[PDB]
Amino acid sequence: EMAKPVLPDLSGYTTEAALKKIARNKPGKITVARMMEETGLKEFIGGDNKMAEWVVRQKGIPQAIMISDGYVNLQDLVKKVPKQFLSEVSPGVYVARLPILVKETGIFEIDSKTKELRLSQEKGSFIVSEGKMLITNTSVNAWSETRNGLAAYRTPDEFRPFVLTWGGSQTWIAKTKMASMGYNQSKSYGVSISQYTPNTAKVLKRGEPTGWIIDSEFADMWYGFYCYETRDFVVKGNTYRDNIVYGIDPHDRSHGLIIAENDVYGTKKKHGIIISREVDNSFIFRNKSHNNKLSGVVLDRNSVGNIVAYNEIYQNHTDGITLYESGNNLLWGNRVIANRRHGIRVRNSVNIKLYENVAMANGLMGVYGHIKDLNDTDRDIELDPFDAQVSLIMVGGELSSNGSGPLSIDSPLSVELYRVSMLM
């Protein structure tokens, strides 16, 4: 029978290791120049004819603070950039009134000497990196100058500052607090790690972005974390609290992700943790995901080869774990407790392995498997094909005290159960 899963070692993912990640070897170059000259900005904004909203924010032809050709820290920028674009309002507290772009050859650091970097909401500030970026022991917040405080969430389409990295970038964020970033706009969700668009990528062929986000805290974000075609990204030891749509939302053919020892709660609209659209060969382990508006943890749209292990998943307002059209995944030793609906729900997914899971005191079923015809729904069948079959193997663990019974599997292709405890 099956041995317990081998999970990636996390012991090397620390702030001291993050600090040693960059070359502070060669001093870089700082410029303030036109935004629309740069791919890093064109890629998500579009051409010259889309620049008007940025003209309005900056009250002139849109500029960015740019770092390239080596190493620049935030203190270096403050010395070189005019006060009107980057101002120290009190010791170690700075307001950026332009976007900051780390270009491909650029290396950008923020460290403990910075108490807070405030990104101006009104001026349209944000951070985009194509290079290397290291943020440790500090705060970076979306800031409303008119409110004189965080840009607290109000509505989906209102611009809020954000962080965005592109193909070929490496990014390390440790012991850092960020709040109030992101909104309902492509690449602007909050903290977004992303390969270039298909057209640009095929020309640039930069390699998929990567990096770490460790021991940090993200609050009031549109998405706490997002990625697209990203490799080997580490999200470890963080608190994702009171974010709007999702806590952690890896997407679109990302793979090898390590999502571990995070505490994710209070998500206002949807799921605590969701991987969607061929997020494959990843690891979701020892997280707490609780008190989210929908599910604790979701595997969606043909996300396969994953290991979901030893998570505490509880008090979510719908399911503990939901699998949507995402087969060939292992769920091992999760404790799924007191979610309002089902403990573990599996829809249209085959070869699901449920080993040693404990599903207790959920409002509905401990485990629920079903099929559903998704044709003539809003689903894009070409992009996200599906098959209306469900099958699973359950070994060990416990299903007890669930509101509607230990399990229901409607129309399965096959179910096998071995040595599952179901207390009566």
From Swiss-Prot:
Q: Which reaction does it catalyse?
A: [(1->4)-beta-D-mannuronosyl](n) = [alginate](n)
Active site per UniProt? H251 (proton acceptor)
Which keywords appear in this protein's UniProt record, sorted alphabetically?
A: Alginate biosynthesis, Isomerase, Periplasm, Repeat, Signal
Q: Which organism is it from?
A: Pseudomonas syringae pv. tomato (strain ATCC BAA-871 / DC3000)
Localization per Swiss-Prot or TrEMBL: Periplasm
User: Could you say which protein family the record assigns here?
Assistant: Belongs to the D-mannuronate C5-epimerase family.
Gene that encodes the chain: algG
Coiled-coil segments, which residues?
none
Q: In which pathway does it act?
A: Glycan biosynthesis; alginate biosynthesis
Q: Name one GO cellular component term.
A: periplasmic space
**Outcome of swapping S276A:** Retains 54% of epimerase activity
Keyword check for Translocase: no
State how changing Y226F affects the protein, per the record: Retains 66% of epimerase activity
Q: What is this protein called?
A: Mannuronan C5-epimerase
